[PDB]
Structure formats: C-alpha cells, structure tokens
Design a protein around this ligand. Sequence first.
Ligand code: ANP
Length: 352
Amino acid sequence: HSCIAVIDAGSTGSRLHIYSYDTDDTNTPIHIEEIWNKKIKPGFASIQPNSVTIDAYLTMLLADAPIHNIPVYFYATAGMRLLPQSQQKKYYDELEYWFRQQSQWQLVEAKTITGNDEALFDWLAVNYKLDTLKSVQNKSVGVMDMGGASVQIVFPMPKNAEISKHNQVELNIYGQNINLYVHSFLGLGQTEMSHQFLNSPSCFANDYPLPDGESGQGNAPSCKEEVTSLMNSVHKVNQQIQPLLALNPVNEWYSIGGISNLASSQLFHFENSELTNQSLLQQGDNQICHQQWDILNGQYPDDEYLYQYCLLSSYYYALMVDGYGINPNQTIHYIPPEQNLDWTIGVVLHRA
Ligand SMILES: Nc1ncnc2c1ncn2[C@@H]1O[C@H](COP(=O)(O)OP(=O)(O)NP(=O)(O)O)[C@@H](O)[C@H]1O
C-alpha cells in the first residue's frame, strides 16, 4: 500500500486526510481508503501570517498523525482565493519555510487551487464513489458543488479551441481519456452570497426579524428573481454555462455541498436521495417563505439553518434553473451528507 496526505485548507478550517491506496495496471489508484483525518479551526486565510502563528497552526493540524515520511499536498480553496495574491504570498512563504525545517512531511505542493481545479476534484470524487470511472460509460455524468464560498459545475465536453483552456481539463483515468468542462463562481457559494440578501424580505419567512429591523415577507419567486440578478448580471452564469450544457447534455446530475443538507432536513420531503428544482421551490415557498416564522421556529427549534430555507431553496433554483439552464422537472441526485463525500479523494486519483 502507498500513502498520501491531502490538506483541504477551507473557509472554516483545515482538514488533513491521510489515504492508503494501491495502483492498478493503468497507473491509477484503486482501493483508496481514508486511514486518518484531523480538522482544526479557524480557516487558514483568517490567521495572522507570521512564523509563530503558522507554526502553531500546522503543528496542531499535523502533530498526532500516525505516519512518518509521507507526501503531502496543501491545497487552499475559496477562503484564500478571496485574498489578494500579495497577502496570500505571506502565508505561502511561511508555510514553505515551515515544511523545510522538518523531514516527516514531504511537501509536494502548497498552493491555492483554482475553482476550476476544485471542480475537477469534485467530479473525480463523486464518480469514484459511484464506481463510474473504471469502465467506458456512454452516460454523461455532471457534478455540482453547492459550496459555502464558491460553487462548482463540471461535465464532460470535447476539447474546444474557442473556450478558455482554464475551463477545460484533460486527464486519463483507468486507461480512458477524459475531457471535462469545469467552472467555478467565486462569491456565489451560499455563505458568501447570503451576505447580500439578509435584509431582503422576499427571502425570509413571514415576520422573521431582519437585521435592519424590517420583517420577512417571503415569496420564493421574488427571492429567486433577486438571486438570479446576482447570478446572471454579475457572475454571467447563464451566458457562460447554458450554451455549453445545451450542446453537451448530461444524462445524470449529482450534487454535493449544502443542498444535500437542506434536502436531508426534516422540513423538506425528498425521496431516493434526489430532488427536482420544481419541488424544491414549491416546498420552500409553501413551508418557509409564506409560513409564519414564530410558529415554524417553535416546530423545528433545532435546525440552525431553518431560518435560511426560503433563501436557500430560492437560491438553488436560481442557480440550477435560471443559471445553468437545467429543466425544473429534471431529477438532481444528491450525495447523502452521511456518506462524507470529500473532494480530496480526487487529488489522490489525479496526483498520487
Ligand atoms: N441544513 C443545511 N442546509 C443548507 N446548507 C447547509 C446545511 N447545513 C450545512 N450547510 C452548508 O452547506 C455548505 C457546504 O457544505 P460543507 O462544504 O460540508 O461545509 P463545511 O465543510 O462544514 N464548511 P466550509 O469550511 O465552508 O467548507 C456550507 O456552507 C455549509 O454551511
């Protein structure tokens, strides 16, 4: 067995993953098993970028690991992407120095991966879990990550000279050439985007107390329309994605991230670990947007995201339907939250 470590340096914290694997006769990892993990808070991009702080942080993350002499990839995501490159450099200068002072961890790369890179890993992670990678599919699989700070979309598409090279990836896995379109929208993740909508009455249950002192008066179509403006006028989601998706239809959609949590909640009713956007918007509109808040809160006092469900159902619909151009009646699978799907397994597949 070979071993590799991957650190996901995300927004709320950093998670170290240690994987064992074998390699098959296509030079591709198989039997990938996570043998150890560790999560620390807060996010790397939120700590003071000096030697003492970074030493304390990396020591806390790595110290108890049951290994000696393992390759490690340190990959930061949207949290670091939101920082100026001059500020990011401070972190990486300290990190590079820290790894050089020790011998147990063999640093391969430490960097902020692009949203496009993250999309690739998302697609690999989901397809590995579904066991759709080892043999030729003739069945187009697309993946959407509803992340906290960025959202990713990724689907098969033949190499196209007219499209940015950064939105296209080429790789060979289990002996097969794959060509994927990848795209990420930074800031459109549900935590970041929500900061624009907190005083929008259409996005909250009736009588929900908004920060500015006004009251929720929810209406999913109205909240969706608001969100759609941000998506298409600022992020240009529809303009970029919809034509390409039209020309390269996906046969099956899988989603990961927040949507899987919302869909698995006690409030929403979905079966078969799947949903349609039509049903999502209807349920959000009826059960939250037009629902009296105080009564609702009394009934679901333990769901900390409950108050956001009018906004989030509206937002997911805006993204998939008005943004990506997915039919409202199209089935969207979601990976159950309890399966702990993690994009870092894609790093093993692509880089180990
Ligand atoms: N019940 C829920 N409904 C909707 N979203 C949720 C729910 N619970 C958690 N989420 C969010 O879904 C997004 C993506 O999930 P996840 O990537 O697993 O978050 P995390 O790893 O816990 N946080 P982060 O460091 O930002 O990646 C995050 O913004 C979570 O806050």
